[PDB]
């Protein structure tokens, strides 16, 4: 019967499936993620 406190983040599972891909293509100053969650997912 063990208890541990936790912390919920709103978009910590939407930026996880991101590859770093140290190099960038033409003008793309951002990245893409395999999946995509909203803040309805803790």
């Amino acid at each position: 019967t063990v208890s541990r406190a936790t912390t919920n983040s709103k978009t910590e599972s939407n930026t996880a499936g991101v590859s770093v891909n140290v190099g960038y293509q033409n003008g793309f100053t951002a990245n893409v993620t395999t999946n995509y969650s909203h803040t309805t997912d803790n």
């Binding site: 999946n35 995509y36 969650s37 997912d41």
Partner: protein, 47 residues
Amino acid sequence: GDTLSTIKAQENQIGNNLSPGDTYPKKGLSPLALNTMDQFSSRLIDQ
């Protein structure tokens, strides 16, 4: 061919809104419970 059981949907099982091509629950989420049998009686349930 045979019927195991025919079940309605309950409060926890109902769906508020389902767009065309959408799903309940929506795409990235998990499936549904299927455990209620409307009066909250825990639907019971060779071959």
